[PDB]
Amino acid sequence: RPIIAFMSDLGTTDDSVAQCKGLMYSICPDVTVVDVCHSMTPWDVEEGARYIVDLPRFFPEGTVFATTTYPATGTTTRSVAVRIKQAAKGGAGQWAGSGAGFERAEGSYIYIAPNNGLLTTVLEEHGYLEAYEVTSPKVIPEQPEPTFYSREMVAIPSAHLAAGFPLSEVGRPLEDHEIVRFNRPAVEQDGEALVGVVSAIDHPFGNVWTNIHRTDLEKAGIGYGARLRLTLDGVLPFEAPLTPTFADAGEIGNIAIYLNSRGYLSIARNAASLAYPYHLKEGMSARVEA
Amino acid sequence: RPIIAFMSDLGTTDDSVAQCKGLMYSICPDVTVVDVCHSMTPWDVEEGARYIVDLPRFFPEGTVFATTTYPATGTTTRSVAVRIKQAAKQWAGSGAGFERAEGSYIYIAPNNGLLTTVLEEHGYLEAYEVTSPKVIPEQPEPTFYSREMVAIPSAHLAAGFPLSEVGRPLEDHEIVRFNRPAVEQDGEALVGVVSAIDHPFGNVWTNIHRTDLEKAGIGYGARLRLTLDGVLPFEAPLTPTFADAGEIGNIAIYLNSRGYLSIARNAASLAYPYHLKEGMSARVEA
Amino acid sequence: RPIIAFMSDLGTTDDSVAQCKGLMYSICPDVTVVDVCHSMTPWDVEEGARYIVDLPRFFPEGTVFATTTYPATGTTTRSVAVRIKQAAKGGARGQWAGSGAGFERAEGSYIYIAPNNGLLTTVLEEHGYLEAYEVTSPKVIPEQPEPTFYSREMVAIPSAHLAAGFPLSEVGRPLEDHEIVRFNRPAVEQDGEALVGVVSAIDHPFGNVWTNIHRTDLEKAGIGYGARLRLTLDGVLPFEAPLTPTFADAGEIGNIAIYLNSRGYLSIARNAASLAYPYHLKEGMSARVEA
Amino acid sequence: RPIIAFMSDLGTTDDSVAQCKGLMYSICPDVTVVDVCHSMTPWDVEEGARYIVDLPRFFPEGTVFATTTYPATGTTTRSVAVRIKQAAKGGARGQWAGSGAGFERAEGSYIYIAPNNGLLTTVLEEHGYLEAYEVTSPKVIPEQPEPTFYSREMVAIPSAHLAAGFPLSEVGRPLEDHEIVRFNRPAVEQDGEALVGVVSAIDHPFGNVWTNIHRTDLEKAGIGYGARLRLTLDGVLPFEAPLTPTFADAGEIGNIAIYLNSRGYLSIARNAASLAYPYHLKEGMSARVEA
Amino acid sequence: RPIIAFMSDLGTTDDSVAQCKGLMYSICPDVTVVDVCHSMTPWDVEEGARYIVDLPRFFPEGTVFATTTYPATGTTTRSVAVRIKQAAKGGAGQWAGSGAGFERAEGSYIYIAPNNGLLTTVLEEHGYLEAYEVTSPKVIPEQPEPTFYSREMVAIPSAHLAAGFPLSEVGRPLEDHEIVRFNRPAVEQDGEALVGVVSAIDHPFGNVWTNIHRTDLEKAGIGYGARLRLTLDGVLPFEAPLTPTFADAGEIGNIAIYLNSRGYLSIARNAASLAYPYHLKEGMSARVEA
Amino acid sequence: RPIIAFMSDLGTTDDSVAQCKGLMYSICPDVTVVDVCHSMTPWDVEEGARYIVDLPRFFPEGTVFATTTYPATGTTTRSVAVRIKQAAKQWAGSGAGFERAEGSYIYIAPNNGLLTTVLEEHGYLEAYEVTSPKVIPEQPEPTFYSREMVAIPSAHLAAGFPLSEVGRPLEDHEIVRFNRPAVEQDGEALVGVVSAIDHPFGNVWTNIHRTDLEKAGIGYGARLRLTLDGVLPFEAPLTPTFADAGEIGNIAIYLNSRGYLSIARNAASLAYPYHLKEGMSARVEA
Ligand SMILES: C[C@H]1O[C@@H](n2cnc3c(N)ncnc32)[C@H](O)[C@@H]1O
Ligand SMILES: C[C@H]1O[C@@H](n2cnc3c(N)ncnc32)[C@H](O)[C@@H]1O
Ligand SMILES: C[C@H]1O[C@@H](n2cnc3c(N)ncnc32)[C@H](O)[C@@H]1O
Ligand SMILES: C[C@H]1O[C@@H](n2cnc3c(N)ncnc32)[C@H](O)[C@@H]1O
């Protein structure tokens, strides 16, 4: 029972995703294609990365992740296919599922993506066992569509991998320095305050996500129940204790400062939108201190 | 051939829904997950209820409906899981339609009133709290009970985990319900609200029902005056469908697929040019 | 392993698509339902036609395409079901889709079921058809259809019977060619040495600009990759670039690229930036090309 | 104490109006310049005409109205200067303006100077005129006018000479009636017992709705204060109210009022709330009235 | 040299204001008409009031203020004309002008307005010497336009007053209880914090004005140089000392908490807009404390 | 017959401008106040400068220009008051125009660069700091120096208060100037910026001047290619006016009333449909 989990920038306004899916079911008759999302900001590899980094532990072993934003479509560039090392615990650290969670064995998931840095945080968080350039005409078209490499060089070969084509056969092995990566912005300790950035607005709720992690917090002594001052955009400070969840803020509309399901320091209002009335946005400065 | 039909307020702009689906396939390898929608206004229990209330008759017997908006996530609250009784009409499908046996569907949802109308329309045979670590995490992620307390246990139920083993039976009073706004009277006009804009067409749906109408003496021929937001008046005979208005753009006053007084333009949008909205008053007279 | 690929104007904000899907699994339990899209502008049959015309070569033979925008719901009109002839190559070069030399698809191997309102105009034009039938039989539609929901009653439902193996010729009577409603499509005019058409679509979510000037139209004027072109939009915007395979060929990020899209049509874009969104360019605007 | 009342399409965001004013005080030192408005949609002569047609009765006799939208700036066209005949009553009842029984104004006592582009169509129609002249004399316009600024060169400047006492008949040659450009205005049709016109304007900043159905048109059908009316807008909105003098007559705040505006025209509004803004009603929409 | 200072809700998009001005110059040949503003939110008498309350000290003695929003136009209602008592010092309290300012004698300005509460704060701040109902056909039309009382019952009689028509002759005297007034929202002392409201956004800068006055501040001990916490909309707190001016915030974009030229506690950014990016609005809660 | 022409960033949505005017009439009973505009983008010194630079030739001799955006309000800063020399062309008005004597106009402004282009184009005969309590308040309102340090002293100057008595003479270096962006070269294309959108018409004005053009070999007949924001290309002959384009909506490339390369549609807006903006690059080639 093979699964391909599919994350693109193709959107859902036309037949582009369906074209890829038609070919996936064509190549791997038994497959199940699960949509991750197709809504990412085009060409923003850092945003694409956040949508895929945390997926392994949720999926059955053997799952292939077809993940693509392909601004270098139709060039001489070729995709990278990697088998990861650890499925890894996550959240605000645990295995996912009922009971004590589902423990995932090492080397049980493959990502196939453009070699443009999309997989940077996947490789940082999970490690990898082996990496290959995707070049074989057994898995890609002999004459690929210049402007559709997300289909030609990701969707199509991912379905061959789902169908059982040996990963080592897709092309030559890539050395670590041949896999492109993006530079991750570092959390700064500024006196005793921690300085990062709004990493994401959490749609559709309007919760605010920072790149300040739970590990960064236990570094400066911060745990659940700590009074914090969190300044956004350099001028809007908020104040609240760190709490597990939204309803701990008290009344509806009140401010909650919490750890999100991905482990990162976040801010919201209790059953109300914070970001949307005050037009708060990704990329704004975020500062925290007790 | 187990099915989970999935309705949430998680949206489709990140991997939140995919995390839930991943766990569904892990738990029930042979499952088919059907998306209902994930677009609902966050925390609007009456809105989410509208999207799930008439689903059973359309699905194969044995379908599990996983339906969630969870603003009380991470608290001591636990989900409710119910088996409904009557799948409830006409029947849907080709010919005279497909009849559905009683007790053939399970809903699992936060215990916050989301299931209010499902229970009124269909009734139930059994209701339980979802507490067993067989079907939910021992360390549940505080901010993601739509995943922990709905998605995960729905998939155990799809795989044949016995309903009565999820936790203790709930008595009726323990099952939270929302109050639904009444259709009131002033003179011979009926006063209600706009209960929804029908995206993407811009049709207007009111809470004034077939039954409220015929009781006040209105059937499929009646010339009606329909005033919206207390300002915009519309006038037209009650008709079965849009094209009964004649010209493209003409006004149709009709009954939507739920028996509710509705208003639209024929093959054009009514709501969008006039910025008509849910929650606006709707007053009708013959 | 039967597939129904589903395209409608029902949107993704309520339970309308799910009702259709439920009834698909009810009638054909082993079916796989693949969403094409549900976002088309309601009642724009020309736009709907664009999202379904290119589908066959990507799908397994025996696939059923349920394609629907239904402004005449609740009327005496009934849907039309067609077996197409050629699965038809396509793309910028014109080839089969898939790895290696692509997946060659046999003739008469796909069914489309749709309102009889012109939605299938380009499907028939580009693929031809082998047989067409009016969808009237109570075996495949409800005896009491919901007046406002013919996308479900007259398309979703019968499509699932067809996917289950219900004989096509049994849905109702054969339709003569003149009984299949069509729309007229704009002809690219050969004006001097220029080619005059329109912006056919904005390519969401990138804001690329698609015209109705097809690759074969370009070969009427003898224009291939490397040709220095002037592509004028909206009468007043004379863009200038060589015709190149892809976006990155334009050099720096933001530079204008003139290219052939994945559907075989003359297009214009910027390299890893949006052309249509900043300047609010729209479908329907004029598009002129010349060398 | 000469007055120039000034209406243009120049806006209030730069120094364009001030340049015109400066030259007014330069040519006629004791002048008072009164802004009519500078907000009209550029080049919409019909809208401009609405802001100037009702002016004479409010102003001292001898006032000069400099009224300008000039899309043909820099061309061989020259402005036209007119002495009107009747100052003309008006308003919902039809009377003179001011305290007591109002200020009665004499015949032939106001001058309008404008581009010869139809801007003065309703002025002449409603007031008549006694003499008209092309504005050509270097005594009142520049010998080298700025190509893009004929609102200044061919209207502001000569208007200030006229206010200073420059003889009207000396600006240039007399113009025959057919030489004064006009636009055609929509005729309210007598359809059955209904009267069919349009929404002429949105009354900013209140969002009241003005139609082109005049009080005298209502008296063709015999409609006065107290008459229960149906006023249908945009073909689909049948408003119902008695015809009343004013807004508060409708009762509660927000209730629909149907009334005669201060310009003598059939209008519709809400009592101390906006009708046009919430529902995005627009000029050009249809307006039908009947009793 | 008579002056009429003219404040309406008529806007500047049509000839409505010019009609009034034509009649003003008709009635009072020597007059100068100064526009206060015509931009107010229609029918909002509290907003109209803020635009007129502070005008007397700036204008020559003898000035008439014609001030109007007239939602009761065309009814039996009649305007009120009042001679004020004190011109009054103002600002963050002084006379206006070069040197030590221009001292204005008592009873030297007249307001004419609808009797709908528009003049509430004028009468509270300045007092009055005499008040009259405007009813004489020597100053108003015998048949006034039903829908244009701002012209008929304000503009027109104001010009008669400018022209020298005796104020006592416009109609009968009104007793204090016959002059309509609006209820002013009270500043609350909530513990040691002061609770009011955003009274206005200061266009075009996007500065935020509160109804918390300098007097309210010296009541709780607050002067220039006091560290303050100011919460807006119940969730956005800001922190800054109270300073005289914007540039005291330091760098451009920094927050300044100050007293405005009208005497009220205010918040802004130094040469940047505060209200506009965060969509802050009139009517939002405002809380302050040291 | 004294005149004050008044330009500020105070807007027209409250009584800020009326307070200033009130004080002008108090100080100079016989004054005429002319509004220039009050709409300028707050604190944009180059923008406000554009609105005041060519005013003198249009006004009677003896006019005082009160011109202010004052982001440094309430600090130790004091305003500058200058008498300009050459009123500077053609001359404006009927006939051959009205010549203006030298030294006939005074500007008074914050000393923040607002007067940069006025001084470059016209020159000056004398410049002073505004410090005398004869002409400004002793207790100046900290947040309203546009009123205290511009409006009030301008009106004393209109009334005949001697210029040299406002405070001490300033040397040229004490008068703050802004740097103006240069028109540069790349190949035979000239590169500049859009210096303004011409509201309300939506015409586009560039900083590429008549002089920059003719030096590169371009006159009133030249077919030019004009690219805006680095993306949108336009092509058209250089013409005197809009109507030279022919059809309504056609493209005109012309010189605005300041000698600057400009682009527009004939009797339609160019900037608004395309969302063209000030600060966007403008590149021209013959
Ligand atoms: C197949 C890939 O083409 C890329 N793509 C789409 N449009 C552009 C563009 N204008 N420039 C560069 N890349 C683009 C998308 O990222 C898609 O994933
Ligand atoms: C897992 C559940 O978390 C809830 N959720 C998301 N954001 C908030 C918030 N600010 N307050 C309360 N609940 C929230 C959603 O309703 C989702 O269904
Ligand atoms: C079931 C079908 O109903 C059609 N539909 C929905 N709303 C309208 C309307 N206002 N007018 C005409 N057709 C409509 C949709 O096109 C859908 O496909
Ligand atoms: C003469 C006065 O008419 C008032 N006015 C304008 N429109 C309305 C309306 N729709 N309802 C009530 N009053 C209105 C304005 O406030 C103006 O000042």
Ligand SMILES: C[C@H]1O[C@@H](n2cnc3c(N)ncnc32)[C@H](O)[C@@H]1O
């Ligand atoms: C009196 C002067 O005050 C200035 N002004 C108004 N708001 C601000 C602010 N937030 N920062 C700096 N200056 C400001 C204006 O520029 C006005 O001209």
Ligand SMILES: C[C@H]1O[C@@H](n2cnc3c(N)ncnc32)[C@H](O)[C@@H]1O
């Ligand atoms: C001096 C006159 O210039 C006219 N004007 C300004 N811009 C344009 C344009 N793009 N097209 C035509 N006329 C224009 C205005 O209407 C003004 O009145």
Ligand SMILES: [Cl-]
């Ligand atoms: Cl799916």
Ligand SMILES: [Cl-]
């Ligand atoms: Cl004025």
